[PDB]
Design a protein around this ligand. Structure first.
Ligand SMILES: CO[C@H]1O[C@H](CO)[C@H](O)[C@H](O)[C@H]1O
Lengths: 133, 16
């Protein structure tokens, strides 16, 4: 797949991603906060089409992500991220995609998520998060 | 060396 790396910012304003109910997660793109002003991150598109778009718009800065969780699984012989759920201090967004395979979850007790990096081919291959105070 | 750094967790999904 095609690797990407957004880098670190000062916060998160909007997350936009797409999924498919039979396969996994496709496109991924995020609007970050850069010192009090919006910042449009590059858009990480999938190599194929057919996904459903989802827009998650946080009420920044009073609302922020407090737990990220999902499922990773085997699709067409490849290991990919199959589901994704974002829970904040106000509401939960998810799950999106198939909830099947091996689950992972990252609850934050103190700190913030300020950046993302990963890789997408047909589906999102893997990803990592940037943490901070 | 002149670039700031931050902690990073993952990846989750395919290896390497
Ligand atoms: C069908 O293969 C394409 O997508 C898969 C799954 O996302 C892998 O990323 C692979 O590297 C890429 O060529």
């Amino acid at each position: 797949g095609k690797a990407f790396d957004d880098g670190a910012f000062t916060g998160i304003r909007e997350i936009n991603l797409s999924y498919n109910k039979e396969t996994a997660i496709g496109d991924f793109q995020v609007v970050y906060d850069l010192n009090g002003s919006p910042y449009v991150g590059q858009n990480h598109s999938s190599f194929i089409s057919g996904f459903t778009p989802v827009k998650i718009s946080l009420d920044f800065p009073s609302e922020y992500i407090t737990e990220v969780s999902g499922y990773t699984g085997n699709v067409s012989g490849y290991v990919v991220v199959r589901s994704l759920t974002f829970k904040t201090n106000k509401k939960t967004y998810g799950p999106y995609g198939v909830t099947s395979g091996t689950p992972f979850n990252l609850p934050i007790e103190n700190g913030l998520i300020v950046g993302f990096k990963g890789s997408i081919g047909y589906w999102m291959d893997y990803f990592s998060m940037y943490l901070s105070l | 060396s002149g670039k700031s750094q931050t902690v990073i967790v993952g990846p989750w999904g395919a290896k390497v």
